[PDB]
Amino acid sequence: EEEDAGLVAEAEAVAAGWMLDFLCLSLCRAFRDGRSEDFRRTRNSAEAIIHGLSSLTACQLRTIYICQFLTRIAAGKTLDAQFENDERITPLESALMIWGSIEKEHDKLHEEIQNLIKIQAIAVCMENGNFKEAEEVFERIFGMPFKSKLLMIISQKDTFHSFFQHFSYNHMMEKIKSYVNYVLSEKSSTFLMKAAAKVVESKR
Question: Does 81 engage in binding with Ca ion (CB under 5 A)?
Answer: no
- Output 53 or 109, the one with its CB closest to a copy of itself: 53
Long-range contacts of 111-119 (CB under 8 A, 24+ apart): 112/175, 113/172, 113/175, 113/176, 113/179, 115/146, 115/167, 116/167, 116/171, 116/172, 116/175, 117/73, 117/92, 117/172, 118/142, 119/150, 119/163, 119/164, 119/167, 119/172
Residue 52 touches which of a copy of itself, Ca ion, ligand A9E, none (Cβ within 5-8 Å per kind)? a copy of itself
Residue 195 touches which of a copy of itself, ligand A9E, Ca ion, none (Cβ within 5-8 Å per kind)? a copy of itself
| DSSP 8-state assignment for residue 86 | S
Question: Does 14 engage in binding with a copy of itself (CB under 8 A)?
Answer: yes
* Residue 122: other Cβ atoms inside 10 A: 25
From CA 47, how far away is CA 162, in angstroms rounded? 38
Question: Does 61 engage in binding with a copy of itself (CB under 8 A)?
Answer: no
From CA 197, how far away is CA 179, in angstroms rounded? 23
From CA 38, how far away is CA 30, in angstroms rounded? 6
Q: Can you give the C-alpha Rg of the chain in angstroms?
A: 20
Question: Does 98 engage in binding with ligand A9E (CB under 6 A)?
Answer: no
Question: Does 38 engage in binding with ligand A9E (CB under 6 A)?
Answer: no
In the list 16, 79, 102, 141, the residue contacting Ca ion (rule: CB under 5 A) is 79
In the list 46, 73, 89, 176, the residue contacting ligand A9E (rule: CB under 6 A) is 46
Of the listed pieces 65-73, 77-85, 166-174, 190-198, which binds Ca ion according to CB under 5 A?
77-85
The number of C-alpha atoms within 13 Å of 191 and in the hemisphere containing its C-beta is 8
- Output 66 or 150, the one with its CB closest to ligand A9E: 66
CB of 96 closer than 8 Å to CB of 118: yes
Question: Does 52 engage in binding with a copy of itself (CB under 8 A)?
Answer: yes
Q: Which residues bind a copy of itself (CB under 8 A)?
A: 5, 7-8, 10-12, 14-15, 18-19, 22, 26, 29, 33, 38, 41-42, 44-45, 47-49, 51-52, 191-193, 195-197, 199-201
| Residues at the site binding Ca ion, with contacts judged by CB under 5 A | 79
- Which residues of this protein are in contact with ligand A9E, per CB under 6 A? 43, 46-47, 50, 61, 64, 67-68, 71
